[model samples]
Target: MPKRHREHIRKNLNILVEWTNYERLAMECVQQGILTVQMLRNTQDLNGKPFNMDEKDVRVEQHRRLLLKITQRGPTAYNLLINALRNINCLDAAVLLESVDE
Candidate 1:
């Protein structure tokens, strides 16, 4: 069941990335004590350089890394993320996670 949640999240990754306002999402995650500042900072490169990268790439990569961080703790992490999104008034995003069929 836990693994199923992770798989469901991964399956919906693209929509989540597009629909989220990542800065606020990250802030809510921190506020909920789900993630740390260093973890957010590390979403980018180790050297803090993003050369020749488009805006879309930056968001996509960051959300991908965010999901990776969340999923590492397994499904409970994903559930917390849903709560985090709601705390930030991201009801649409929260419902996206909450309403998944399987």
Candidate 2:
């Protein structure tokens, strides 16, 4: 990933942790119309091809499969390194390495 994209993911992870910690407040915000559900849409990967509901469901299943593989394989570091090399451009190597370490 690019530096900016890695930063965005870190921000998202923080947001997820925050939301989990403050579930009541987060739910209140949604219930009171302070934050729309649409605000949580796939904003990060918007440049990728659009996905319909069926495609998204399939992707979720694939994510589960991939997670299982990662857990069972016990080589997350090497797998992540490969993924960084495959997905990120050469200019993003440093950031990708940092992101994977995180």
Candidate 3:
């Protein structure tokens, strides 16, 4: 991770902790098929919203959106989240994001 991004993570530790818990809760929703990206993107009414910036890369979009939604327990988990975003759907995003070592 760049010192800058790592610092961002450290500074946002509280928020990240919040995300870890939030992700677990969200996992149930994911399993229930109730928290689709379409659904999440539509749910920006202030309880909170996922950090989504439309990207040319679907893989990066998928995992980046998921990491924002589900949370990053840490660096390893962060990479894992990116990894899971891969499939036929968005391998390119994952391909790109995964290539960067942080």
Instruction: Identify the leading candidate in terms of TM-score.
Output: 1
Overall local distance difference test of candidate 2: 0.34
- lDDT of the structure predicted as candidate 1: 0.71
Q: What is the C-alpha lDDT of each candidate?
A: 0.71, 0.34, 0.41
Best by lDDT: 1
Model 3: per-residue Cα lDDT over 1-102, one tens digit each:
334444443444343333233344334335433356555554322223223533333333333344444442344544554445442234544444445454
lDDT of 3 at 21: 35
Which scores better on TM-score, 1 or 3?
1
Candidate scoring better on lDDT of 2 and 3: 3
Off by over 4 Å in 3: 1-66, 69-71
Give per-residue lDDT, candidate 3, residue 68.
Answer: 45
Span of ten consecutive residues with least summed lDDT in model 1? 43-52
lDDT of 2 by residue, 17-98 (tens): 2222123322332343223465322221232444554664544433322222222223342344334333323224324334
- Model 1 spans > 4 angstroms off: 44-50
